[PDB]
Ligand binder design. Sequence first.
Ligand SMILES: [Fe+2]
Ligand SMILES: [Fe+2]
Ligand SMILES: [Fe+2]
Ligand SMILES: [Fe+2]
Ligand SMILES: [Fe+2]
Ligand SMILES: [Fe+2]
Lengths: 244, 245, 247, 245, 248, 245
Amino acid sequence: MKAKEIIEFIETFAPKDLAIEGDNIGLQVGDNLDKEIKKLGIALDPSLSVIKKAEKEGVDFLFTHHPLLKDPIRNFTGVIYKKLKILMENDIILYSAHTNLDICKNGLNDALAELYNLENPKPLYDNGLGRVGIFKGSFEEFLEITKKYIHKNPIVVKSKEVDDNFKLAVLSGYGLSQSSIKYVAEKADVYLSGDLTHHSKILAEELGLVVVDATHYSTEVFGLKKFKEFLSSNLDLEIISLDF
Amino acid sequence: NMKAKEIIEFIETFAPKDLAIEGDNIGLQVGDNLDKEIKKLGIALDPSLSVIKKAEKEGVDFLFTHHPLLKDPIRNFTGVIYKKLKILMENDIILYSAHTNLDICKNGLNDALAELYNLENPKPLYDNGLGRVGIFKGSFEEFLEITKKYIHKNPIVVKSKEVDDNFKLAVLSGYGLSQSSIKYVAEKADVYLSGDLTHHSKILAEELGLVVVDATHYSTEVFGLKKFKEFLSSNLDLEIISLDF
Amino acid sequence: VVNMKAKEIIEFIETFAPKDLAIEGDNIGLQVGDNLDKEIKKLGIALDPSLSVIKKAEKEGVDFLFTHHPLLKDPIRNFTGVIYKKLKILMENDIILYSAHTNLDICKNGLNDALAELYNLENPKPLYDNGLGRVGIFKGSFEEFLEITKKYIHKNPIVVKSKEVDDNFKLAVLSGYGLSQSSIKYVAEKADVYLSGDLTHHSKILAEELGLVVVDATHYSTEVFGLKKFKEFLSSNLDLEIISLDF
Amino acid sequence: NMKAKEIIEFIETFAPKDLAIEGDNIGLQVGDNLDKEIKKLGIALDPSLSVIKKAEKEGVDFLFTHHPLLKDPIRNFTGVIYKKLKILMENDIILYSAHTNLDICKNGLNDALAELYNLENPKPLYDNGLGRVGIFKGSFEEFLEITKKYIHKNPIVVKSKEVDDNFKLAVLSGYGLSQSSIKYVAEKADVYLSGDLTHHSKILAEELGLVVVDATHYSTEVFGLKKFKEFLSSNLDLEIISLDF
Amino acid sequence: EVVNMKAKEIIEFIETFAPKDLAIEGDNIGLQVGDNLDKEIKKLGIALDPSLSVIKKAEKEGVDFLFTHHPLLKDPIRNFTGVIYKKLKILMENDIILYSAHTNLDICKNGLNDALAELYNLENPKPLYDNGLGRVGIFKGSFEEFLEITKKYIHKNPIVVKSKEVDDNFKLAVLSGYGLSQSSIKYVAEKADVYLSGDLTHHSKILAEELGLVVVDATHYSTEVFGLKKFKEFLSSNLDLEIISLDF
Amino acid sequence: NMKAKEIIEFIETFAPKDLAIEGDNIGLQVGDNLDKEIKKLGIALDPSLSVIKKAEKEGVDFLFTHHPLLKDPIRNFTGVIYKKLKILMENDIILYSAHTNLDICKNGLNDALAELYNLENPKPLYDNGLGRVGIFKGSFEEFLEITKKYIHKNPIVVKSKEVDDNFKLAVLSGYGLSQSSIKYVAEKADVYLSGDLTHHSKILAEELGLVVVDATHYSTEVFGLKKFKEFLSSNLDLEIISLDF
Ligand SMILES: [Fe+2]
Ligand SMILES: [Fe+2]
Ligand SMILES: [Fe+2]
Ligand SMILES: [Fe+2]
Ligand SMILES: [Fe+2]
Ligand SMILES: [Fe+2]
């Protein structure tokens, strides 16, 4: 397969126009997209160690969920220099699907909704991010699923008691901003996401929203693993994971 | 028999308001007549709803907090903010905050951390005076043991590289672990002690080789806030209690 | 005469003056309040949520305070001085404060319609694109228009008589503050005479240059005319004691 | 006798342009050759169309106004501004303004008001130098009588509270009655004399207990402008007339 | 059979050919200087620029209505001194109307860009930019023939940035006026082999060389005046009015 | 045996980075390890693709340019910038720029022009230090002949007016012929020597009566850049070649 064909397949699953405004999705680093691809690597982050591992494992198409850069730059030194040097010197293509992969059908948020078997799931935000629906079971059962499948030691902000058959909101990645807490508190009893910080914990306690931080990494890697299986099943291509 | 304005004078002598960084909402949060006599002072990290309820329950007349009531301004009064204000106003509880001016001032929250680790030749970490950095005269393991004994029993350690003895330690009380902070501090220190670590910042520290120790936002401020509470208790003839620590 | 829940009063008011009619950025709706199941015995109406209005509301046992102007235009993050005094009174008495501002200016039979109907404007149209103000032909003389103004709105309006006004002229009306320099420039292309409130020096000079006759019947009176109509409307439909506080 | 540039130098010695507040469009409004000989100088508050027509009718060569011709810039020349510019350009009448620099300078428009009321220990009201404030050594009624005799016969008085003798009086020539000004001045004075009162500012003054006297924008400026005109007449051998006062 | 027209009739005619809503966002088109548009017009003058020398020549020649492609001012002002004072004074004391059709004249059918596309007989021309500016299509011939046309009809010594060899039947982009900004070079490199426009500067030359876009600078003036002459001929054919050109 | 950081130190001593105007992207463009030993330094006006290819071909390990690689920041790497970065990174070629700091410094690109024309009592043209202006002690024709001999054989001359002997000459290396520059310099000089003339600026200069001589952006910079190259060659024991001049 050619790089552009891999990109075509991925964009059919996760169309770029589903990405939220300003999200740096698509080609991160690359020039010739007609090149035949020897090995595909999948990672959450285009980190320096991921990129070093890509070169070591002979990966020539590196797919990541997070973009290489959010903020644009005009000097190339330090860590970004080391990263670009490896990608360019080895002609490794770097391509990202970020919020388009969060939002698309069977994408990262759908993977969470399906894991918890949410009843009548809907998008949490108007832009399509996150899912919300009824968890048909006890709070304890929800926690066991979280601990078994996502993360063993989640932070639980137990802001109030949770009855059976509650509204569960899920957001893969960083969903625990203060403004998100305020928003989700109007829509759900429990909010499962990642990257909890102090001010957001206090706000959830005030609003009575139960928050479960199963970490940014794990709430995304759960769906990313499913995405990797989908690619492996459909493409005649060697595919490896680099930071999971 | 102290007046609210005299408590405010005492606090602002320790932590002058002009030390606060641009835009920080410090000073009087809620209150009108500052000639009011104050019988009981409450100290808290956060002006949360539960802290404010506890203040009312305990007969607190002056509520001092590190964090301001609001960061972003509002023009409607409903829900939680309505509930908070209602309690403060019907009890005429004054709410007053010292935030980054208390981080930055001499013997404030960052100085308290610097003194705990006995930093050699300490300097402000940032140009605006936030944080401290200097040499820790000992091993990484000794630095960790101090952290576990006095700050947080189990901090997250991002061990991005090996750390030699007599290393450069930067400390910042509260939330110091933004991505831009990681990048900045990596140029100034081997080890960075602060709070509120998140994923992108963890990855960035590993790339840069900066060892990051997250002893939490709460604990890295409450360490110094307890010192500030003792300082107030020693100098003021006033009943003083802590509400969320 | 019975008691209503606050949410029922709000629902009625918003059917008359829908919130989506408000112009961009206008702070309309709930100003101060939490539980809208609160039972309401006495509804108070005011132009302004002033300190004296709020004191009178407390004094008169008002449970629901409706005002045309919002409590705050610019948001705040400290609560001291006057705003402290106002909120303390409202919160201690759990008085709900609710506002309908430009949505009440713009809606059918709202404040601007009330003026257009008073002057019996022929073929009235909205004055601005956002629906604010009204303009049409006044079927009469300038003096007849002034006497109507004097009888119903304000007895001694300031008249900037920029030119002679012939019978059957184009009259623009805007309830409240409609006399900014940019408004004078805009309305000068649309009307012979502009009736509104809050005239200041640079706007007077500008009107004289443009030949636009301006009548300042005051911000207060040009809104209160329609606010009285609104109060009568509520009194006719709601079984509630309803009082006016600053008019 | 005199060239325009000499008239300008004299005015700018009295009211230096660097006194004008940021963004104020002061100085040469319309003109090219400043060596032009000037026989007749006209002074006006506003560079209005009727003032400019009168300048042309009276053979004015140099038109001085307090207010600038334009606050906001334009890139098309039609309607009233076309009419104004055509009269000035076709007659090579120079139009020059001193606006807030004339408000702020020593013996300028605000100083003229301070001196009329014989304010004790006067200070600038704002940090940028606008307005004056000091003690009025007399009763409220005496202050009002001075106001009515020398400034405007029927000022609007917002009597927000009782005013005792020897009160703090703030004065600002022109438009000083914005909401943000009311809030500011309420901290500094018992009584505020200025112009261009509107509804929201009246309500706010009542809430704050600030007594406000609107003696109008026009009259509170023209008082000092008449003084300025006499000063010019005393010092320049030039025919000098006033156009809108 | 030469008569006087009212200014508003001239404006109506021009705006029928080049409607104001074709002008790009922010473009200062329409009436520049003037008040009464019932003014009777005996002599219409056409110019590229409302320069001081053009306005002086207009006054000298008794022009009553001055039409220019470029607006008098792009950026607004609030003081009237120096050159703009000199210009406005001449226009106002003589009550000469100044009116401009700028990008609406660039974009309209048979406007300045179409005139270039037609001169090069572009095959299947399309607007170069989405807002309608410029034209692009196939030049059915050799690069050398394209050059000969350029030299004969537009400008005798055009600057050629020969970034690569150009084969016959290439994609030719044209933009009348200043089309050679860096952002334009980048954009057009994706759409054409050759870019004919005006006002080349150093950074743009380097960028064109990097991208392999052949750029031909036939000057800002000449790439617009070619079409402006057509426009003047069009007016002369349709209005029974004396019409002269002032800076061409 | 000299290190990249030592080359950079030498250059920044001559042209300190703090002389660069606000926002100018000067300093290290591409590079990581500045302890690297440098065997061959290349000097160029532009970090163009052809310059960078030539640098690789000639074995240049330190590439110095006047113009920065990027003015506007990017967050994707494709096309031409990909090709350029790849060549630099795969060969570990350092790219370093001194832009307006080299324009402004003593004996920098603008001083070099001022010295060529032997300007009398030269001063900076702009407040930020850009450009130079002073008296040319000779005729306009003598000035043109110097230009033709040393800078550019055939400069564009916009002869807006006649020029008397001993006129005021302003020089600015590179692109100095913006419309706002034309307006500014017309107040300070009779003749303006710079580069990159476009139509609107030509018209404006004719209106103002400012004589403009466009000796091209490239040539007015390369003149001083050659001087800078000789200065480096005279002081550093290093192979130094020029790449686009
Ligand atoms: Fe993420
Ligand atoms: Fe904090
Ligand atoms: Fe109003
Ligand atoms: Fe004024
Ligand atoms: Fe043009
Ligand atoms: Fe340059």
